[PDB]
Amino acid sequence: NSIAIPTNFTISVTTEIIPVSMQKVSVDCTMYICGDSEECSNLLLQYGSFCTQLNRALHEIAVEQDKNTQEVFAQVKQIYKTPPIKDFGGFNFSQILPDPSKPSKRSAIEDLLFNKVTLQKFNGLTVLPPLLTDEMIAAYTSALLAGTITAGWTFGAGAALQIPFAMQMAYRFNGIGVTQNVLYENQKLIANQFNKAIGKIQDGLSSTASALGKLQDVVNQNAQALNTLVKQLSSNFGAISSVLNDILSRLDPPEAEVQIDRLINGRLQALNTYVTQQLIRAAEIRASANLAAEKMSECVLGQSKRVDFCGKGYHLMSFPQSAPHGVVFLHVTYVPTQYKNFTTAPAICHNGKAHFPREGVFVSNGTHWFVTQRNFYEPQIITTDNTFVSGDCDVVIGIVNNTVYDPLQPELDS
Amino acid sequence: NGLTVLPPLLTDEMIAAYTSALLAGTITAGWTFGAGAALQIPFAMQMAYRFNGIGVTQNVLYENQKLIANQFNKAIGKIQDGLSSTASALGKLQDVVN
Amino acid sequence: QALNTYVTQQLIRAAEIRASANLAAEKMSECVLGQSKRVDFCGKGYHLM
Amino acid sequence: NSIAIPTNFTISVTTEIIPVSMQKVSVDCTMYICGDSEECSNLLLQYGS
Amino acid sequence: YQGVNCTEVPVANVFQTRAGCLIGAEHVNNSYECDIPIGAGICASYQTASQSIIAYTMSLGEENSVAYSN
Ligand SMILES: *[C@@H]1O[C@H](CO)[C@@H](O[C@@H]2O[C@H](CO)[C@@H](O[C@@H]3O[C@H](CO)[C@@H](O)[C@H](O)[C@@H]3O)[C@H](O)[C@H]2NC(C)=O)[C@H](O)[C@H]1NC(C)=O
Ligand SMILES: *[C@@H]1O[C@H](CO)[C@@H](O[C@@H]2O[C@H](CO)[C@@H](O)[C@H](O)[C@H]2NC(C)=O)[C@H](O)[C@H]1NC(C)=O
Ligand SMILES: *[C@@H]1O[C@H](CO)[C@@H](O[C@@H]2O[C@H](CO)[C@@H](O)[C@H](O)[C@H]2NC(C)=O)[C@H](O)[C@H]1NC(C)=O
Ligand SMILES: *[C@@H]1O[C@H](CO)[C@@H](O[C@@H]2O[C@H](CO)[C@@H](O)[C@H](O)[C@H]2NC(C)=O)[C@H](O)[C@H]1NC(C)=O
Ligand SMILES: *[C@@H]1O[C@H](CO)[C@@H](O)[C@H](O)[C@H]1NC(C)=O
Ligand SMILES: *[C@@H]1O[C@H](CO)[C@@H](O)[C@H](O)[C@H]1NC(C)=O
Ligand SMILES: *[C@@H]1O[C@H](CO)[C@@H](O)[C@H](O)[C@H]1NC(C)=O
Ligand SMILES: *[C@@H]1O[C@H](CO)[C@@H](O)[C@H](O)[C@H]1NC(C)=O
Ligand SMILES: *[C@@H]1O[C@H](CO)[C@@H](O)[C@H](O)[C@H]1NC(C)=O
């Protein structure tokens, strides 16, 4: 016969990082294999269509990368400008909204993340630039964030009006089972906690660059693989020399061609290994990009009821931020605190009747019994309006005597 | 000469302890799991909460608690018997090992 | 060649197993610690616990 | 103009199993290929990494 | 010509872009929706004398104004 009900709460903002895309790489097969040697090129003709297959696979991966990026970001039909009024319900979005030349002393989280991530013409290899530049990614993110802030729940198929922010926050509060009269009474404290959390996040990000290991690992692995592939050119594989010219000069054709064949086989094996591993990594990164797109759609454009899908606690809203080859989310969540102990009963025995609460639970202050919601202590007198009535006092285990009031009788008497 | 199998970091007892702690917390506490309320919500209240969750009114649980508990116990016993009879119900793990 | 083939097979199996592990973690979070409204995500019928 | 409504309910319990982890394996490459003979290892050193 | 400057190679519609040297495309500066990708934000299309392929900077979408009021 005991139950705990919160009497306070806190607003928490957390961070999540997801990689999206990979570097696009194209390789010339003949340049890597032979390197401007006519005898080697003639000998390579006996292997059919290997280089074609390698190039085709690399090209497909390169296409899939931009496909992933456009799947994640290009979700918005229109461009929403930043409103020239910053008068919200006490919330300052300065550190997450952009700035055309960024001349303000307050640096956007974009710059911090970019700097935190930050902190050949003779080979047969080539690296291609992505279709979308960083500025366009930032523009998409800013437009999406501004549209979510301004239009509220009318973001899609929207109109020419701005829903006030406090009303959106009240609707989100209703979303998790807390009545908006709670928000309208300490909006000021809500805004103060939100601003303090944002400031703490910015300071923590500016403290260290080690939080972006998930994004750093992709670059490290790709560079390691490329360096291994490049360094494999110096091996002998059992031949006399690792240079074609030395083999040509030091020997006659009837053995030079055999040595060149040995070298060709070795380098073909190396290329095959590299391409296979790249293919597997591309599959993994596509899975990650799909997860990122799903999270954007289900948590930025709406409120989610899935537990621990958008951080701990109860989800309220989230904001996206761009990053090198990835995204960053900022989940805003509700957390109850300062619990208290009380006594509870399943039902109330009136004159031969059993009364169940329409919503919430029955609580006792030792003397008086009240009905309140399960996530914020706000007791009320047990009225016949609040109580659903069914059955008798026989079968319910632990039912308790009490009195149920009725507003009708005093009104009738007067 | 050349092949080695390494032990997993977490032993079986640790996994069992994690599961036991998680289930005990979910059972003893209710919607207050996580935050250290540590009071103990009655189980029937949680069941009524869930019943309201699936769209039926809690009086239907309070009026048939005994029968509901009997059905739950019988289902648990049936699962025990089914597990005891057929020792090959775990296919996927065996396939991985094989 | 034998060693290379074995390594590639193991890599593919590991990818499959980590997908399964992600599903398991999601199911734990969604079902054990709460009540899910997704149909047939937690067995047949209406989910209770 | 006709509808059906239940009058009794039952409680069902079912199970499902999900693999999580694989066996952990390490292999001595050089010892596997050469079997601890210097003549083999000297030639193996010419194959790179 | 990918990854190549126009000062050397064409000697070895001339226009220089971040993606390389592009030959045959008339450059305008009215943005449109992307039709054939090129790279680094450059997109090309066949757009009807002089029914030629044109090169332009991609447009992210139309802008939307929304009144303001508390
Ligand atoms: C919350 O929003 C307010 C604006 O409504 C931001 O206030 C501005 O914050 C910047 C930097 O935090 C202030 O610049 C600094 O001001 C001090 C004051 O002496 C000056 O010494 C520094 O050299 C620098 O210029 C700016 O004055 C301030 N403006 C106002 C009107 O308050 C605030 O920064 C936002 N919250 C966070 C956490 O950034
Ligand atoms: C719990 O609620 C109390 C009020 O019931 C909050 O107390 C105030 O907290 C602010 C902090 O910004 C102080 O400046 C006030 O002096 C406090 N007033 C009183 C009467 O205590 C408290 O902040 C709430 N808990 C949390 C974590 O915010
Ligand atoms: C409070 O509820 C209890 C329920 O047990 C009532 O106890 C019974 O009351 C009836 C008459 O109202 C008696 O005939 C029974 O013998 C009582 N049983 C027990 C075990 O006490 C009790 O009367 C209720 N209180 C009031 C003031 O009506
Ligand atoms: C459906 O629910 C009713 C309850 O209203 C069950 O009726 C009782 O069931 C138990 C066990 O099933 C019997 O021991 C009782 O004798 C039944 N009471 C009456 C008045 O008939 C009914 O059995 C349930 N249906 C099934 C298949 O269990
Ligand atoms: C309520 O009081 C009891 C004893 O009076 C105590 O054991 C319990 O911890 C208290 N509740 C909370 C949430 O601390
Ligand atoms: C419990 O609260 C009610 C209403 O706030 C009050 O009337 C009652 O006296 C309180 N209980 C005690 C023991 O003071
Ligand atoms: C043009 O030539 C300069 C001189 O080296 C070079 O830096 C630049 O990359 C070239 N342009 C392009 C698009 O490659
Ligand atoms: C477009 O280019 C023409 C010349 O090519 C120039 O006269 C005009 O001002 C430019 N307009 C814009 C918007 O860049
Ligand atoms: C909203 O703007 C109106 C003027 O359009 C102004 O009177 C009102 O004070 C503003 N509200 C807030 C909270 O600043």
Side-chain angles (χ1 to χ4, degrees), chain E residues 3-7 16-18 20:
Chain E
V4 152
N5 190 313
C6 299
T7 57
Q16 181 69 82
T17 190
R18 178 59 179 82

Side-chain angles (χ1 to χ4, degrees), chain A residues 25-27 32 120-126 222-235 237 242 267 270-271 274, chain D residues 48-49:
Chain A
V25 175
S26 181
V27 175
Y32 183 80
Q120 297 174 269
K121 303 168 186 177
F122 58 90
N123 303 112
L125 326 170
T126 310
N222 289 345
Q224 179 60 53
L226 253 194
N227 273 339
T228 298
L229 176 64
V230 167
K231 280 178 182 178
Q232 209 65 204
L233 279 172
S234 75
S235 291
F237 305 97
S242 67
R267 293 173 177 174
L271 271 173
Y274 169 80
Chain D
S49 62

Side-chain angles (χ1 to χ4, degrees), chain A residues 13 81 115 143 161 200 230 284 298 331 335 339:
Chain A
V13 192
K81 296 182 180 180
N115 287 335
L161 267 181
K200 283 183 180 179
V230 167
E284 171 182 324
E298 279 189 48
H331 301 290
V335 172
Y339 275 70

Side-chain angles (χ1 to χ4, degrees), chain A residues 365 367-368 370:
Chain A
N365 207 27
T367 62
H368 298 89
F370 305 94

Side-chain angles (χ1 to χ4, degrees), chain E residues 26 32-33 35 44-54 56:
Chain E
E26 171 186 0
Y32 301 99
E33 289 78 6
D35 199 3
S45 177
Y46 182 72
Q47 282 284 335
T48 76
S50 298
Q51 322 301 272
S52 71
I53 305 88
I54 60 164
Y56 52 86

Side-chain angles (χ1 to χ4, degrees), chain A residues 304-315:
Chain A
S304 176
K305 302 301 292 175
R306 295 163 69 181
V307 180
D308 286 347
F309 188 70
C310 312
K312 306 291 183 173
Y314 306 99
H315 181 241

Side-chain angles (χ1 to χ4, degrees), chain A residues 77-85 87 128 130-133 136 139-140 150 159-162 164, chain E residues 2 18-19 34 37-42 57-70:
Chain A
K77 57 183 185 185
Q78 294 180 327
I79 303 301
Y80 291 83
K81 296 182 180 180
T82 300
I85 286 173
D87 293 321
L128 306 170
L131 176 57
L132 291 171
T133 64
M136 313 200 204
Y140 273 128
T150 296
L161 267 181
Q162 177 206 10
Chain E
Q2 302 170 4
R18 178 59 179 82
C34 191
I38 300 302
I42 303 300
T57 298
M58 193 202 345
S59 169
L60 306 178
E62 73 277 21
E63 284 189 322
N64 197 337
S65 165
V66 163
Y68 310 62
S69 69
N70 301 314

Side-chain angles (χ1 to χ4, degrees), chain B residues 52-65:
Chain B
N52 279 339
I54 71 163
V56 300
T57 57
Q58 54 200 52
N59 62 311
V60 85
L61 160 77
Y62 285 117
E63 295 155 11
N64 301 280
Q65 177 171 342

